[PDB]
Design a binder for these strands. Structure first.
Length: 65
DNA sequence: GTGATCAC
DNA sequence: GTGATCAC
């Protein structure tokens, strides 16, 4: 599935399969991605986040340490 | 300010 | 070792 986001301003969308790290900053979801390139970075509202990313956040919220 | 990061 | 980013 895809998440569309703001960083800079050229608009963006990314397959959740290409998302390295996910975490919560306040009521915002922040993540890093890419592979062929640099580590891309993005964030979206925690309300308007696609269930999949939230699944990934939940995954990251239980990781030990 | 908040996490985590990149990019300088 | 600090600013710039991101949604509030």
């Amino acid at each position: 599935v895809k998440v569309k986001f703001k960083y800079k301003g050229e608009e963006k969308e990314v397959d959740t399969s290409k998302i390295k790290k996910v975490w919560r900053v306040g009521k915002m979801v922040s993540f890093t991605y890419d592979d062929n390139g640099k580590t891309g970075r993005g964030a979206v509202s925690e309300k308007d986040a696609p269930k999949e990313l939230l699944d990934m956040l939940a995954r990251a919220e239980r990781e030990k340490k």
